[PDB]
Amino acid sequence: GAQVSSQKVGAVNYTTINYYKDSASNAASKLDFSQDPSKFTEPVKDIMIKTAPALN
Amino acid sequence: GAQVSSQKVGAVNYTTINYYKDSASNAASKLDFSQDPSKFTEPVKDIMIKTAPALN
Amino acid sequence: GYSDRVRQITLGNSTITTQEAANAVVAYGEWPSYLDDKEANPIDAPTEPDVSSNRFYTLDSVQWKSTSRGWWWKLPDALKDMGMFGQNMYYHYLGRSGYTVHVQCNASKFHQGALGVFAIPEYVMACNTEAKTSYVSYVNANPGEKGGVFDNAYNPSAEASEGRKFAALDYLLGCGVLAGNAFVYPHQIINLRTNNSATLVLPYVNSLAIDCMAKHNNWGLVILPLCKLDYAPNSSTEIPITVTIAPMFTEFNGLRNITVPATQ
Amino acid sequence: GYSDRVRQITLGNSTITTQEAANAVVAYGEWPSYLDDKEANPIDAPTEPDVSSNRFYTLDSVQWKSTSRGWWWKLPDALKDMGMFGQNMYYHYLGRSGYTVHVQCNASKFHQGALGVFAIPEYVMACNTEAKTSYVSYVNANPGEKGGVFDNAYNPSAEASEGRKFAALDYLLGCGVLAGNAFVYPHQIINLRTNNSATLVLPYVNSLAIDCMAKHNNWGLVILPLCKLDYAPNSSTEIPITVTIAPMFTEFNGLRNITVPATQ
Amino acid sequence: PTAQSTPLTSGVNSQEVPALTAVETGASGQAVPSDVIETRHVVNYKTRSESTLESFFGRSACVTILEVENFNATTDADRKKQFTTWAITYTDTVQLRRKLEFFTYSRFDLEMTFVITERYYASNTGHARNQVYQLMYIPPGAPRPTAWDDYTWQSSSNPSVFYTYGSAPPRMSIPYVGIANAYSHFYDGFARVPLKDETVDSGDTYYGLVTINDFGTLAVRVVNEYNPARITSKIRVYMKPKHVRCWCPRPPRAVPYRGEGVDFKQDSITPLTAVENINTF
Amino acid sequence: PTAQSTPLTSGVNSQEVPALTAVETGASGQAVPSDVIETRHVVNYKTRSESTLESFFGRSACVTILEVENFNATTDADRKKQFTTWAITYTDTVQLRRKLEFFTYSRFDLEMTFVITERYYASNTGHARNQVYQLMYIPPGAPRPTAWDDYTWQSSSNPSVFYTYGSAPPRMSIPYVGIANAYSHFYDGFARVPLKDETVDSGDTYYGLVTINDFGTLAVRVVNEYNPARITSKIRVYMKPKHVRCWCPRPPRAVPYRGEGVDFKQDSITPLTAVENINTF
Ligand SMILES: CC(=O)N[C@H]1[C@H]([C@H](O)[C@H](O)CO)O[C@@](O)(C(=O)O)C[C@@H]1O
Ligand SMILES: CC(=O)N[C@H]1[C@H]([C@H](O)[C@H](O)CO)O[C@@](O)(C(=O)O)C[C@@H]1O
Ligand SMILES: [Ca+2]
Ligand SMILES: [Ca+2]
Ligand SMILES: [Ca+2]
Ligand SMILES: [Ca+2]
Ligand SMILES: [Ca+2]
Ligand SMILES: [Ca+2]
Ligand SMILES: [Ca+2]
Ligand SMILES: [Cl-]
Ligand SMILES: [Cl-]
Ligand SMILES: [Cl-]
Ligand SMILES: [Cl-]
Ligand SMILES: [Cl-]
Ligand SMILES: [Cl-]
Ligand SMILES: [Cl-]
Ligand SMILES: [Cl-]
Ligand code: NA
Ligand code: NA
């Protein structure tokens, strides 16, 4: 049950096998590049178009 | 994700598996026999043919 | 015809209008909702009071002066004595609620000033004695609709028994962080030249599906003068700030006799 | 949402905004452009400095008072000491340029007044001695960013040597024509009740494809108070007028050592 | 996925005005350079890999220092030095705490690592054989030791780790153990509702997370009996949150902590150094 | 790939003259033996494997020696012996430095290895329990320790390695961390432009790479508290560049270094030993 994944590039793959029956034992979660800044930077009810006036 | 490669001959293959998620952790780069001495030994604009006069 | 400045909000038998709004905030981009079966916890059929309780309640108004340092409330605390919402809250062990918060402050085209209006999850504030930590009385933590005020000075008590209230120090947001960073929380600004109201719609926020409303406030509401009130003909003028809040998608579990909290 | 009153102009690393504009003028209906091969004259590959020079330069501001008679500048003279535009201008025998001219003057809803803003091709002005004709010094003709002012009186000099400057007589537009007819030139009006800025986009205008910038100004910029500034609480109040100008589609030929004009 | 590349743009003369907005709305400024300057095309190959939550928290941080000793104890005070108990928390130190407190709620598994060190108390009392340590996790309710060699250390059900001095730092993983659906870093409330006219004390009660949190106790002993030479030990406890999720960001701590709560200290509430003038480069 | 084989060639009598050239052009001589002698065929099976950059640099080289001690310090000077800080560099030693300086620019990952040794300071003060070391990498900006047991060592975010005396030499990899697209071994310039009529000092300013380089600090301590016996330690730091690229070759250092720059020393600028005569075999 080996997982082969891309490495973070340096100056290209690596292999992982989980040895333990509890997921808590696992190494770090894989890089998660998810983001949605707008839930904090623009949490407005009505859409604001940049090129338009903010208030009309 | 095992890589099998030729060994450097002695007086014929070996196996590598990367264990880490960062390429910086990897062992030495594979032998790179690339070369282009002419960028230092002959960096001239106009081609020089050995058998010809260097200056004509 | 339609405008970012003009809005109507109707909940139950109550309606708000504004003609100088600035859009509206939906905290973390999430509208409130009822608790789904796949996230539920207490198993008794809940009470969902709907229009009896999910309606606008207007708190006592406060006065903005050039010297005001700001105001705070907690939720659901501020609404604990509000009509049927309060009754449903206290007759049950458990409750959850979202809110529409509408803060109102009009002036004139010749006044100036700006209020930051922030909704803060788990708004834990500092106590006012250095002989103890986390040393705040239930009564002082839960002022109800009167809320509290910020101060620009910190004067902790000589004796521990006298400091069991919040040290609501304005520039540290009453909790040891710089007020200039409060904008990471859902917010609007009432800048008198631009708008006369702020509207924030808040989902239920907690690490649990449902919790004890009488023990635990989910949100703080903070109003801070970012730029002081000024009016040239009378620098001592005062203008009201009025806070009107509607519970939304209220849901209660664990019915019994009524909770009557200590008052002193 | 979009409005004749609200505009953004970006050139190079510079941006202007206005929220009380009145459209914009494109002189003679023609946007500036580079010189086509079929209209070209000097044959050396031209320098086209693009963003280094084609950007907004803000001149020293002037003060509009109830007694002001008006202001004038010449172009490219007014920009001769402006960053890389000035350097490219003086390192070359030949240059051509269009312009975006943005004149700025805000006040209040209680002030009144109106400025005529005119772009005049070949703005030749009268001299100030009647002992000679066309008798103006290079230094007085080319004041640079400070420009000059109009007067409501004509007082020619007793001696020819003392009158080698423009007789910038307001109602004759400094050149023997009635100022009321200046509207035949590309123009806007800054009428304080309506707008706080004027924007004029100017193509290169000349009887040649390209010319000697250090010898010859292609445009005059004239700002005349058509209706005097008035403000009831203080008739002696002054409000700034700020002129910001961007070269456009600049092109230069005949590179050599730098031109350093006489200063006295 | 990469951070944003910059498109080739020139200038504008337009009724579109991206440079203006109204932050009263609760929206932050949104404009980017292409909106307000002429830009070249720049391909951005750089990534935000090291600022993901897993990357930000992907470090073992020291959260406390415990002490235990091994010697022939003849007084109650000295008997209590033969073992130690510690209520598990991240508030004994400031660094990991401050990072966690960028957030209101979190959910993670924990890697715990320990560094154990010794020194001789004196040089005129011979030597000491290599020591084995027991680190026992006592969940809430389980009996706590009152002596280093009492029955609790048999640890039939509590997890214990036996560590041999000089061996690699010991390490174990702990699942997300919260009784809620996430951990709360802040709790604006109390553990019970005080009721009208009750006789329960209201003058010495506390507020916030301290009234409701309990992650159990770590108990540590030296398993060996005493040598003639007294040995004193330190146990440094390290925590690394892994498999991390967090919710509801907060301004970070701006002034010194003075305990487990959010309270601040009167002599330490002036974080900014005043500038000479508003125009100081 | 192999080095060049030699072809079978005889003699010539020809207008082709490969023996002559003109090095004024900037070209080196190009002629090979077959051009100027009669040659046999020789198959060349030999390779340039060991002179690739990876092979040339594929060694862990000592770059510095640090010292730390563990004893009961009662003076400021002795307190400062309980930990050490070192600005990370390759210029404390000469061998790796000289090899790197065959090139102007480089790009590589780094393997860092450490060798840690101890001795007793004296024999009349008993003994000392086995010591654990902390080696903490402090990137530029992170707080530097002022005492061996201050808060900085909790190392929530800085990488630290805890090493147990007697264990295998510790080792870690470091990525290419340069803020440029390659490391510069030489920088012909300054960190700022001094401007006309400014009051900033121009008499004590420096030049070159020293004005712009900063790879942070290594901080080392013994984690243990003091024993009666004072222990003194050395930490040797080793670097191996790996995954190496280099650009723009340079003549190698011909005379002794006298510091971090290219400066030379007046008593050591005569590398050649004079020959007796131009005709000396
Ligand atoms: C912790 C500590 O300071 N221990 C010190 C002891 C004790 O002070 C006395 O032995 C107690 O009486 O004294 C020494 O001289 C010793 O025994 O060699 C040095 C040692 O470091
Ligand atoms: C570093 C060093 O030289 N240490 C030496 C010490 C010290 O000089 C004195 O103890 C200090 O007073 O003296 C010895 O005779 C000792 O203690 O056995 C030998 C030992 O090698
Ligand atoms: Ca906009
Ligand atoms: Ca030749
Ligand atoms: Ca119902
Ligand atoms: Ca652009
Ligand atoms: Ca023991
Ligand atoms: Ca031959
Ligand atoms: Ca130590
Ligand atoms: Cl109330
Ligand atoms: Cl000028
Ligand atoms: Cl036991
Ligand atoms: Cl034993
Ligand atoms: Cl300063
Ligand atoms: Cl520590
Ligand atoms: Cl220790
Ligand atoms: Cl010789
Ligand atoms: Na990109
Ligand atoms: Na060969």
PDB file of C-alpha atoms in Angstrom, chain D residues 137-140 261-264:
ATOM      1  CA  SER D 137      12.847  87.531 -24.893  1.00  0.00           C
ATOM      2  CA  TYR D 138      13.289  83.753 -24.948  1.00  0.00           C
ATOM      3  CA  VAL D 139      13.423  83.703 -21.140  1.00  0.00           C
ATOM      4  CA  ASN D 140      10.113  85.578 -20.750  1.00  0.00           C
ATOM      5  CA  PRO D 261      19.011  77.016 -22.802  1.00  0.00           C
ATOM      6  CA  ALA D 262      19.989  80.499 -21.623  1.00  0.00           C
ATOM      7  CA  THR D 263      18.501  81.433 -18.230  1.00  0.00           C
ATOM      8  CA  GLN D 264      18.918  85.236 -18.303  1.00  0.00           C
TER       9      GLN D 264
END
